[PDB]
């Protein structure tokens, strides 16, 4: 009931037996013959890239609004998977985002953990455009805001419109999980590869966005540690590439 | 140290053998005053310090009485003292040559701190002889086996 998961000869994550969300209903898989357009063979690096990339922990404070990571840029420096983003041209990968919190029984709160495919984001100034430096950092989260952002080339980071101009309660349409600290502790979503082409270049394109939004805010009394660490762990699935070359970009 | 045997061993890169060491100890009476006169019999201790073992700084040291270092007590007038030492190495052979360095950073000496250590041999008189001096001469006849 405290079963350990070992993925590759480097990683150990301890976890109890809970519920998973599998994509839009499909497991990640390898490309078959009547699915690709490229003129070569994939040569998938299964022997080295399937492991757990535990990112840094964020602190869910009382006055926090939400965080998002854009993928696959969220593993740009994470080990050999970041090297394959350099020394290739096309790529195709599913992921198994595992999100878990360490709260006591005297804490309360609720999170919504969404995976949004093609989460294109609007700018904080109309009649203007975003830059790539405001969409995502390479490994750290980007914070939503309670009030209105007002920059020139930034993102409209207000929290109830989710950066996309929609209702934040309707993000339940995409693959999601609720971390309710009363009963739930962890959340694990298995995203497949969703695109309109069989393989894309994973520098320009952002495949999906992982958003973690607190709907019921964190409350605690005065004895308690005044934050709850949220730890995200991403494991790539069935990664395969094409176009061996040097690191042309970055 | 001995060139004649060094050239025969250096026809090969990797060797593996036991040792068969034999000690030919002949003593004599020193001249001068206060002579030995009635000397009863000379006993000699030959100690093999296994590699990484306590090594005597000088005579009448505790290293001599260490249980770890194998020793032979031999009395003069009979057959010479003999001992056999097995293949003592962390490695699987001794190496006459080592194209490499002792530290992992390629630092130190070009092939001298290698695991080719066989140990030491230390010999002294066991007697407590006050009057007279007795000078002994040791001859080591080394021989590899197997």
């Amino acid at each position, epitope marked *: 009931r405290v079963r350990s998961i070992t993925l590759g000869n480097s990683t150990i994550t301890t976890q109890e037996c809970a519920n998973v969300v599998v994509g839009y209903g499909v497991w990640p898989s390898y490309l078959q013959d009547n699915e690709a357009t490229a003129e070569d063979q994939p040569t998938q690096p299964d022997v080295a890239t399937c492991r757990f990339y535990t990112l840094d922990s964020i602190q869910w404070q009382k006055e926090s609004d939400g965080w998002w990571w854009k993928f696959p840029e969220a593993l740009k420096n994470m080990g050999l998977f970041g090297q394959n983003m*350099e020394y290739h041209y096309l790529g195709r990968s599913g992921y198994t985002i595992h999100v878990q919190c360490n709260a006591s029984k005297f804490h309360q709160g609720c999170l919504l953990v969404v995976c949004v495919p093609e989460a294109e984001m609007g700018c904080s100034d109309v009649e203007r455009e975003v830059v790539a430096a405001s969409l995502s950092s390479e490994d750290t989260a980007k914070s939503f805001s309670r009030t209105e952002s007002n920059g020139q080339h930034t993102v409209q980071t207000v929290v109830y419109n989710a950066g996309m101009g929609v209702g934040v309660g309707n993000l339940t349409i995409f693959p999601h999980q609720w971390i309710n600290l009363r009963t739930n502790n962890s959340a694990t979503i298995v995203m497949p590869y969703i695109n309109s082409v069989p393989m894309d270049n994973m520098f320009r394109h952002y495949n999906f966005t992982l958003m973690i939004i607190p709907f019921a805010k964190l409350e605690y009394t005065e004895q308690a540690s005044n934050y709850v660490p949220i730890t995200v762990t991403v494991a790539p699935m069935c990664a395969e590439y094409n176009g061996l070359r040097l690191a042309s970009h*970055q | 140290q001995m060139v004649q045997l060094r050239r025969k061993f250096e026809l090969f890169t990797y060797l593996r053998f036991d040792m068969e060491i034999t000690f030919v100890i002949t003593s004599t009476q020193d001249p001068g005053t206060q002579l030995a006169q009635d000397m009863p019999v000379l006993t000699h201790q030959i100690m093999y310090i296994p590699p990484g073992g306590p090594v005597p700084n000088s005579a009448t040291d505790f290293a001599w009485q260490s249980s770890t270092n194998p020793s032979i007590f031999w009395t003069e007038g009979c057959a010479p003292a003999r001992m056999s030492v097995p293949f003592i190495s962390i490695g699987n052979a001794y190496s006459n040559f080592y194209d490499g360095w002792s*530290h992992f*950073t390629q*630092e*130190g000496v070009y092939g001298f701190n290698s695991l080719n250590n066989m140990g030491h041999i230390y010999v002294r008189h066991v007697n407590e002889q006050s009057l007279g001096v007795s000078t002994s001469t040791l001859r080591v006849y080394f021989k590899p086996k197997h």
Partner: antibody, heavy 112, light 114 residues
Framework: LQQSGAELARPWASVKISCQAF???????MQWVKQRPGQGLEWIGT????????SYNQRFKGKATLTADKSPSTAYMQLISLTSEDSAGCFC??????????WGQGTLVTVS | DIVMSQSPSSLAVSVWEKVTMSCKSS????????????LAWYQQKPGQSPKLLIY???TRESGVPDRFTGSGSGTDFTLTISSVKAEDLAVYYC?????????FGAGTKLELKR
């Protein structure tokens, strides 16, 4: 922003120059420029810490070595077989692939 | 972080007076592979770029006199200046090769007294 203090060297020998950056060494490499008072600025090389790459101009290949560590967070350049032609002011600069930005000061190498 | 101390921070001295200056490390800059201290000595002439004085904490450079000599081991060092001349009035900085943050010392300012 910081550079080595003025030092006196001897020809046919090496010099180690230091550079100190308050900004974290990520996504952008450390520039190295050699200034000739008679002529212009000359690029020596850059060591890009974000991907860890090390590169030099052909003219300086075999002359300059670029090395940046992580915990010290200081960039170093070493030159060897120094001659009077190496006496010059050497600057370290940053590059976020957006501009060469600024350089700062630098000890005047004085081979003598 | 390894810090490098310098004492005295500065001292004024006349001509033909043997001066020294200590540079003590917060960690022994001597590793047990080659037994070569990782310490560098540097002379930054007044309004000038610094130059090398002593590398490996023991060896001289070309165009450098015997009034610049490395000396020491472990975590404490000094640079003996035997016969001072009119080219030593400057600031001197020691430095370590060991820990990757390559911090320099405080900086002794050998001052000239007329």
């Amino acid at each position: 922003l910081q550079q080595s203090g003025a030092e006196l060297a001897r020809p046919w020998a090496s010099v180690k120059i230091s550079c100190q950056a308050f900004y974290t060494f990520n996504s952008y490499g450390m520039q190295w420029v050699k200034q000739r008072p008679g002529q212009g600025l000359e690029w020596i090389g850059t060591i890009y810490p974000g991907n860890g790459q090390t590169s030099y101009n052909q003219r300086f290949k075999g002359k300059a070595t670029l090395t940046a560590d992580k915990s010290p967070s200081t960039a170093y350049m070493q030159l060897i077989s120094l001659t009077s032609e190496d006496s010059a002011g050497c600057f370290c600069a940053v590059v976020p692939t957006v501009d060469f930005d600024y350089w700062g000061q630098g000890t005047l190498v004085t081979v003598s | 972080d390894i810090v490098m101390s310098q004492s005295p921070s500065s001292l004024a001295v006349s001509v033909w007076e043997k001066v020294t200056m200590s540079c003590k490390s917060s960690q022994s800059l001597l590793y047990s592979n080659t037994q070569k201290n990782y310490l560098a000595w540097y002379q930054q002439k007044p309004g000038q770029s610094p130059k090398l004085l002593i590398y490996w904490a023991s060896t001289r450079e070309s165009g450098v006199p015997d009034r610049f000599t490395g000396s020491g081991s472990g975590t404490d060092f000094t640079l003996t200046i035997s016969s001072v001349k009119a080219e030593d009035l400057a600031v001197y900085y020691c430095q370590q090769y060991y820990s990757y943050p390559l911090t320099f010392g405080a900086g002794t300012k050998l001052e000239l007294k007329r």
